[PDB]
């Protein structure tokens, strides 16, 4: 289907266009013509990807001069799969329309977990195992050894890729992980290493945010490619949370106890290994004294160690002070460790600034910032130099060195917090430290600097006005798009009023208030009989969820709920999560019905999409406020008051609202999809909170459905279900909300879609 957008012909691969796409593709084209970053809050229920991918290919096709490569990224691998398969349909039409007359290379990327073929590493269950063992099978020393004695342990797939994969550009085509795996199986090459090398040649690539947000995790695109490359992000509100998460570090006394044993093992190993070899030890000092020591970097580009989380500017090419000598370096690490253990001995929660902590170090252990900045550099060099195999076991020592490097490098804007116990152990001493970085923008700063245009595309974030402040960012466009439908798919409502007139809420600082729990149980019980297939319940906190369920079970409410639908309760165990979701998804499809309950913050709201019959109703119990860990939150809130002048109450509202919008945002992914959504908290009735929800969702959140009684919601639900359970087929969708090629050739499509876009 030839779609022309403001003079740009787009080869759409399907029979119809969702009218929202053209306003979004216009704004996307406009931001690309302006060659700048932009915010586009496009509802998750639309095929925003297909249109986005199509316009990118059209823009790349039409302007290879302006755009060199597209680097898409989505938080989860299943989204990468759907994107790759949705791109396949796009390329299929482009290839059919062109007869494969133009080259195109689409490439999936992920960790070795999903890109290892070697039978000794592929079955390993965790990244430590995979990376440790793979490095043990391919590393500068492993390779050098194997290259002079092929009997030594090695990963054959690397050697094959090294021998044959190198300098062999892949033929144009979309290569999914399964495709690259098969090609790796076929050619016997590491698909992980094959991908990395081939990214230079690829036209489109999809990454996990970490490859771009995390500085220690792989960074494979230089400024040269970024300068003319387009960056596209799912509008995962977590993006700011991940920036700090990719840059923050927590040190616990348990970790130090592991680090101590690890350091002892290494130091004793240094003895016997020094008797094993010493010339290489001296050679390190030589290359270190001679400067960058940087002549092994290409084979250290073939190294399973994370980078230094010191970003570009943070990194330095100076000599690592007087920590060159491993024996003295071991002492330096020991001095920091003991100082930390002593610094962690503090009986109570204390917060420090990076310069204050550095001042304490200089005050007692006299450790200096500059040598401490090269700590990780010294360690990564040492790690290879000592030829140590047990990288997984060496991880706690790596963390400490990186943390020290980070603390010594990001001396401004960040802060440290010391706590003698964890939030999980307020009663018992669990001394911990959190390197709480606060300016998430500093992670995206290099991206905005390296890349030509970073565009965020899903409809989950709101208000858009707060993200340029929070991310200290300035987009070219700040737009939103209205869900355009002939038959609405969504009925957001605030059932904040109990039948007993109790104000259903969690306003009481999450205090034990049975009356709201009781009302929550009544609502859920009756709603379980009203909603078909599956239900998805999100609690504000895991504690409150557990406290609530215990009450409903004690009050017997939970048994009446079981009679209605099979309950599946989430827990931190991946076994529980996987089994619950396994049984829930199929229970929603077998004769019975299931009801998933989880927490609005947990990964369950992140990794699982409630498409169609799965989670036909999403219920948000209470406003999702995290009043636990208030100290760290206060610090970040305070810093936002300082450099950004953002009110804590304003931010708190936003932060909870975006989580509610996540659960709701994942409740629908298509037009033949719909979701009931109850916001069981009076709070949501405030014009401010309602006003900060996504504008395309607010459209359906009509005042008449605010602070509804439980009975009203049940009746409205029965009505809403009755009104949409009715047959409405593909042919009925051509009236409105779906435009065929005939409608695209009709200029009406150009004028009608203009009003679908929104701005903030």
């Amino acid at each position: 289907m030839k779609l022309n957008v403001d003079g740009l012909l787009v080869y759409f691969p399907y029979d119809y266009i969702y009218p929202e796409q053209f306003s979004y593709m216009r704004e996307l084209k406009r931001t690309l013509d302006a060659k700048g970053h932009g915010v586009l809050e496009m509802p998750s229920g639309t095929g925003k990807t297909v249109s986005l991918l199509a316009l990118i290919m059209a823009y790349q096709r039409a302007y290879p001069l302006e755009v060199t490569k597209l680097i898409y990224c989505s938080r989860t691998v299943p989204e990468i799969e759907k994107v790759i398969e949705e791109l396949r349909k796009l390329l299929n039409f482009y290839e059919k329309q062109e007869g494969e007359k133009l080259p195109f290379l689409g490439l999936a990327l992920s960790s070795r977990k999903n890109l290892c073929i070697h039978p000794e590493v592929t079955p390993l269950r965790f990244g430590k195992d995979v990376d440790g063992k793979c490095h043990s099978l391919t590393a500068s020393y492993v390779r050098a050894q194997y290259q002079h004695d092929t009997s030594l342990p090695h990963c054959r797939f690397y050697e094959e890729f090294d021998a044959h994969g190198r300098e062999v550009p892949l033929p144009a085509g979309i290569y999914n992980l399964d495709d690259l795996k098969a090609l790796g199986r076929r050619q016997g090459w590491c698909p992980y290493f094959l991908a990395r090398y081939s990214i230079l040649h690829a036209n489109v690539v999809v990454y996990s945010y970490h490859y771009l947000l995390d500085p220690k995790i792989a960074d494979l695109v230089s400024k040269e490619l970024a300068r003319k490359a387009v960056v596209v992000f799912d509008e995962a509100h977590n993006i700011d949370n991940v920036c700090i998460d990719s840059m923050s570090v927590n040190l616990t006394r348990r970790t130090l106890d592991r680090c101590q044993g690890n350091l002892e093992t290494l130091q004793k190993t240094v003895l016997r290994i020094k008797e094993t070899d010493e010339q290489r030890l001296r050679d390190e000092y030589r290359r270190l004294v001679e400067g960058l020591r940087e002549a092994s970097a290409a084979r250290e580009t073939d190294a399973h160690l994370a980078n230094p989380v010191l970003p570009d500017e943070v990194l330095q090419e100076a000599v690592p002070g007087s920590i060159r000598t491993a024996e003295h370096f071991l002492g330096f690490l020991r001095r920091l460790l003991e100082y930390v253990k002593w610094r962690l001995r503090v009986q109570h929660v204390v917060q420090e600034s990076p310069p204050a902590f550095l001042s304490g170090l200089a005050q007692r252990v006299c450790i200096q910032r500059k040598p401490l900045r090269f700590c990780a550099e010294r360690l990564r060099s040492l790690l290879h130099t000592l030829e140590i195999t047990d990288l997984a076991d060496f991880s706690p020592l790596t963390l400490l060195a990186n943390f020290a490097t980070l603390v010594s490098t990001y001396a401004k804007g960040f802060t440290i917090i010391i706590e003698p116990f964890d939030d999980r152990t307020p009663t018992i001493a669990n001394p911990i430290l959190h390197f709480s970085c606060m300016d998430a923008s500093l992670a995206i700063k290099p991206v905005f600097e390296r890349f030509q245009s970073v565009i965020i595309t899903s409809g989950t974030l709101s208000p858009l006005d707060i993200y340029p402040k929070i991310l200290d960012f300035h987009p070219v466009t700040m737009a939103t798009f209205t869900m355009t439908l002939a038959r609405v798919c969504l009925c957001p409502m605030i059932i904040g009023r109990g039948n007993d007139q109790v104000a259903i809420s969690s306003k009481f600082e999450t205090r034990e208030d049975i009356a709201v729990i009781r009302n929550y149980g009544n609502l859920l019980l009756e709603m379980s009989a009203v909603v078909p297939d599956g239900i998805v319940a999100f609690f504000t906190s895991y504690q409150y969820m557990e406290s609530t369920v215990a009450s409903w079970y004690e009050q017997g409410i939970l048994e009446n709920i079981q009679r209605n639908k099979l309950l599946f309760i989430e827990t931190q165990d991946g076994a529980e999560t996987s089994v619950a979701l396994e049984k829930y998804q199929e229970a929603c499809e077998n004769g019975r019905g299931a009801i998933l309950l989880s927490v609005a913050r947990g990964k369950v709201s992140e990794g699982i999409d409630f498409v169609h019959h799965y989670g036909r109703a999403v219920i948000m119990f209470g406003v999702p406020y995290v009043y636990t860990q208030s100290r760290i939150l206060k610090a970040r809130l305070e810093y936002l008051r300082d450099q950004f002048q953002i009110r804590e109450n304003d931010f708190l509202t936003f932060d909870a609202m975006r989580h509610a919008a996540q659960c709701v945002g994942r409740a629908i992914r298509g037009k033949t999809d719909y979701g009931l959504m109850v916001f069981a908290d009076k709070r949501f009735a405030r014009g401010d909170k309602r006003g900060k929800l996504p504008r395309w969702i607010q459209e359906h959140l009509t005042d008449a459905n605010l602070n509804l009684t439980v009975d009203e919601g049940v009746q409205v639900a029965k009505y809403f279900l009755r009104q949409m359970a009715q047959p409405f087929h593909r042919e009925d969708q051509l009236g409105l909300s779906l435009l065929s090629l005939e409608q695209l050739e009709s200029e009406e499509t150009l004028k009608r879609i203009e009003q679908i876009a929104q701005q903030l």
């Binding site: 000599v319 024996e327 253990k341 310069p355 006299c366």
Partner: protein, 155 residues
């Protein structure tokens, strides 16, 4: 909390966490109860190591590792006379060489014969007395004050 106990008397660790370890040149852990015992008799030597000590020769140092305890005191003592900055060197490389030499001095002072160390101490001390010993101490002290001033201002 983390220390299992002193070889001389460990009851203090189980009794209360407020007490602090006493460091000695002996590089041997001792505690407050031992302090009283040495004051009444045998103040001149370590209770088991037998190494001579000037009366108590006890100082408060809360590190668990006596080697870090000794090295930190060695650090200050060594640094106090090896205040040379990169300014005194043509490059960071030569500076780091000197700094590594100081690490050798530290290790030698920690585990080797002090003859060369003592001679090297005295020679640099006497030669650089004005600039490295005194002038650098002043500049360094000024920076400590200036840092404290920045911290005070932020507070």
């Amino acid at each position: 909390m983390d220390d299992q106990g002193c070889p001389r008397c460990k009851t203090t660790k189980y009794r209360n966490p407020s007490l602090k370890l006493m460091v000695n040149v002996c590089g041997h852990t001792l505690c407050e109860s031992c302090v009283d015992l040495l004051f009444v008799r045998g103040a001149g030597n370590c209770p088991e190591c037998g190494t001579p000590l000037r009366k108590s020769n006890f100082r408060v140092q809360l590190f668990e590792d006596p080697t870090v305890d000794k090295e930190v005191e060695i650090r200050k003592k060594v640094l106090k006379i090896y205040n040379k900055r990169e300014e005194d060197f043509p490059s960071l490389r030569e500076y780091n060489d000197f700094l590594e030499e100081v690490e050798e001095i530290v290790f030698n002072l920690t585990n080797n014969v002090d003859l060369d160390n003592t001679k090297k101490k005295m020679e640099i001390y006497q030669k650089e007395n004005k600039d490295v010993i005194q002038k650098n101490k002043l500049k360094l002290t000024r920076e400590q004050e200036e840092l404290e001033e920045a911290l005070e201002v932020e507070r």
